[PDB]
Structure 1
Amino acid sequence: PARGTLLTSNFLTSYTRDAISAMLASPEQAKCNVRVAEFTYATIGVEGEPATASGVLLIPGGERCSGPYPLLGWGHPTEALRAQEQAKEIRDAKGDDPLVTRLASQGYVVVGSDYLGLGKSNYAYHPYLHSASEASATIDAMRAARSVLQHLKTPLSGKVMLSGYSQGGHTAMATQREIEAHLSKEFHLVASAPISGPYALEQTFLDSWSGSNAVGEWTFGILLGSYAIVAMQHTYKNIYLEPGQVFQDPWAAKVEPLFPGKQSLTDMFLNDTLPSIDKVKSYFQPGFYSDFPSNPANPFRQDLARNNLLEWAPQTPTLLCGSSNDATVPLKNAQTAIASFQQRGSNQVALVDTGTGNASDNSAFAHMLTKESCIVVVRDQLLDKQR
């Protein structure tokens, strides 16, 4: 089956313009009714082998919202719950989601892949922070989405845009690079707005390895680092023969089934499935813990490096958004990327900060606040302008 082939499609629910505006009240007003659809499609694995995936499709409509519509590919954040489907999540949230309230309701067709290994995908695991598969899944999601839209006769302007939050920011940028390098004709990319992503992936881990970074305590580091380690092992299989070489007991034996698994990241954090960051030295094996920051050839580190999104020249107008208060994914990521881009001949990438400006508001928890905050900002400062 060709990449992007639509396997199944299905409408889930709908939301009137007024319903959405009511939600916003909780003072922006919706402009479009929003139809929520779900679908599965054919794509590829990390080795290029055939694979399936699922995705969400938000279609705007209404007398005050005639097309043509721009196509926005979206990258969701870190997801540990293997069965999680964005489309059903939105439906289960009565449509109260920024993708619906802030974008689709404003005339943007939103397409998001659940990623390999999640939702209805048939992949054995999720290649967390793996640029290539984050991009392939996203690309193929838009391809399948377009078959659906073509069948529904939804008028598309032809304009394509990208955005994503947290892991989704990495995803968004990874897709941008891929499209710009090889798919400029198929996808007329006019705007890219990665939100709070670890573009300088290797750098992010190195800076917070101790348990904290210049911004604050890397509170969720044990959950994110373990997901990254496990995922990178499944993908490159060069980190360990068995979990014990990296993780101390009794974690080693329960770490792989968790990423992804029967628990959401919030479940794990609240029920302390894994130790808190202050106990990082009690979690990782001593050898591994010290070798990582001092050996660039460390396997996990090389795997992180292969997934940095720094060595290239962005062609598409890009607005990196985040918050200086973010201690989970430091806005430093945005600064390093932009620095690398410029010395490569590109001046297409700009940065926008939504922080309070007070080092006092610094918190790993400020990360979640940037999602909807940055959606509105990048939407107004870049997306609407490139429409």
Structure 2
Amino acid sequence: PARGTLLTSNFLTSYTRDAISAMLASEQAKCNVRVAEFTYATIGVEGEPATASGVLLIPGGERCSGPYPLLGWGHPTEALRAQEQAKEIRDAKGDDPLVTRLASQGYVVVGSDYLGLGKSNYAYHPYLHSASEASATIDAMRAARSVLQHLKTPLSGKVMLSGYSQGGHTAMATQREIEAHLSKEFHLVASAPISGPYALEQTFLDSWSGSNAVGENTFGILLGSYAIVAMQHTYKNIYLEPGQVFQDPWAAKVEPLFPGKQSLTDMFLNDTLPSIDKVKSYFQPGFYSDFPSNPANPFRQDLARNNLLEWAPQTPTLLCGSSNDATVPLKNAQTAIASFQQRGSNQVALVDTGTGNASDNSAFAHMLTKESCIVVVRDQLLDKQR
């Protein structure tokens, strides 16, 4: 099947505007929100045929007529292979910012579960791989449009992009790809990456010790390990066997974990992998010291290929994050904007949702930027570009 071909489609549930307003009251929803799930044809990292799943949020109601803008969404790090966004939203009774803050305000939201997750046939998940993060997202939007055409849902034709954490990386990766090769098919009017590692290589370097200028990179063992295993599957240039990078007993468990039968929270709460303070006993000495002192290091080269700095964004873009974030330093956005401007682009701006107090600096501030940034971005950029 051609990229973007719809394979299966189906409605899961529905939330009335009043039901959503009730949740928010825990300000007011304008739309009822229907949740649908689908699977579609896309490509692998080598351009080979593959499949993936995704979620589709459809707004509707009297004070919520279309034509609706199409918002492509990038979800955060997911280590549980079987996780499907559509079903998680359903299990949470619609209590998710995608429903309560975006679809509820008239934005058709589409998000891919990514290659290797949900109903995808892929053997692994290309974590932080720009090319397939973009391809999976683009093809999800393509399949979603077919679903919407069948439902006769009126679309304005204007497209937007957003995402949180790893999702911010995929949002920008998708923006870059659309701008370079698919702008006629996707009329991009706004992009709002949230707390993403755009300066991917720099982010790993700055937090390699376990801490950065902001604070302790508490979730680093898990996220860093996911990236290494994924880059190995994608580029196959890091190691012949896990033990060359990871010390025992971790070496034997890392690959089956990313992705696997455990969620990132499961791993963190049960210490399937050691805490950040035990980083030196986690990674093999040679690899641990080689990574930062050798730009030719294979893992480093793989991260470099996935940086999103050397290009000139054309779409109005608002990078959001928190200055208190120690997981993904806001430095990322600063570095990104500096690169873009040097390249002749002044389409990108940034908004800081931090407190300004360093005492609030924490790895956990990362999670607080999801909803906070979604609202700010919606109000300051998306609504104006609709």
Residue in structure 2 matched with residue 349 of structure 1 by the alignment: 348
What is the rounded CA distance, in whole Å, between the counterparts of 1:178 and 1:374 in structure 2? 23
What is the rounded CA distance, in whole Å, between the counterparts of 1:380 and 1:276 in structure 2? 38
After superposition, what is the alpha-carbon deviation per residue over 1:223-277, rounded to whole angstroms, capped at 9, x for unaligned? Answer: 0000000000000000000000000000000000000000001000000000000
**1:64 deviation in Å?**
1.1
What is the rounded CA distance, in whole Å, between the counterparts of 2:78 and 2:24 in structure 1? 26
What is the rounded CA distance, in whole Å, between the counterparts of 2:259 and 2:318 in structure 1? 30
Secondary structure of the residue aligned to 1:320 is strand
**1:133 deviation in Å?**
0.1
Q: TM-score, normalised by structure 2?
A: 1.00
**1:292 deviation in Å?**
0.2
What is the rounded CA distance, in whole Å, between the counterparts of 1:250 and 1:24 in structure 2? 45
What is the rounded CA distance, in whole Å, between the counterparts of 2:65 and 2:347 in structure 1? 31
Identity of counterpart residues, as a percentage? 100
After superposition, what is the alpha-carbon deviation per residue over 1:84-116, rounded to whole angstroms, capped at 9, x for unaligned? Answer: 000000000000100000000000000000000
After superposition, what is the alpha-carbon deviation per residue over 1:317-375, rounded to whole angstroms, capped at 9, x for unaligned? Answer: 00000000000000000000000000000000000000000000000000000000000
Residue in structure 1 matched with residue 6 of structure 2 by the alignment: 6
In structure 2, runs of 5+ residues without a counterpart are none
Residue in structure 1 matched with residue 130 of structure 2 by the alignment: 131
Give runs of ≥4 in structure 1 deviating > 6 Å. Answer: none
After superposition, what is the alpha-carbon deviation per residue over 1:161-194, rounded to whole angstroms, capped at 9, x for unaligned? Answer: 0000000000000000000000010000000000
Residue in structure 1 matched with residue 38 of structure 2 by the alignment: 39
Secondary structure of the residue aligned to 1:249 is coil
What is the rounded CA distance, in whole Å, between the counterparts of 2:364 and 2:11 in structure 1? 34
What is the rounded CA distance, in whole Å, between the counterparts of 2:258 and 2:16 in structure 1? 37
What is the rounded CA distance, in whole Å, between the counterparts of 2:151 and 2:269 in structure 1? 43
Secondary structure of the residue aligned to 2:279 is helix
Residue in structure 2 matched with residue 24 of structure 1 by the alignment: 24
What is the rounded CA distance, in whole Å, between the counterparts of 1:189 and 1:63 in structure 2? 27
Alignment partner of 1:64 is 2:63: yes
Secondary structure of the residue aligned to 1:216 is coil
**1:131 deviation in Å?**
0.1
Secondary structure of the residue aligned to 1:21 is helix
What is the rounded CA distance, in whole Å, between the counterparts of 2:62 and 2:160 in structure 1? 24
After superposition, what is the alpha-carbon deviation per residue over 1:288-334, rounded to whole angstroms, capped at 9, x for unaligned? Answer: 00000000000000000000000000000000000000000000000
**1:119 deviation in Å?**
0.2
* RMSD (CA atoms): 0.3
Spell out the pairing of 1:198-217 with structure 2 (5 A cutoff): 198-217=197-216
Aligned residues: 386
After superposition, what is the alpha-carbon deviation per residue over 1:118-146, rounded to whole angstroms, capped at 9, x for unaligned? Answer: 00000000000000000000000000000
Secondary structure of the residue aligned to 2:3 is coil
**1:13 deviation in Å?**
0.4
After superposition, what is the alpha-carbon deviation per residue over 1:54-93, rounded to whole angstroms, capped at 9, x for unaligned? Answer: 0000000011111110000000000000000000000000
Secondary structure of the residue aligned to 1:329 is coil
Secondary structure of the residue aligned to 2:50 is strand
In structure 1, runs of 5+ residues without a counterpart are none
What is the rounded CA distance, in whole Å, between the counterparts of 1:290 and 1:184 in structure 2? 43
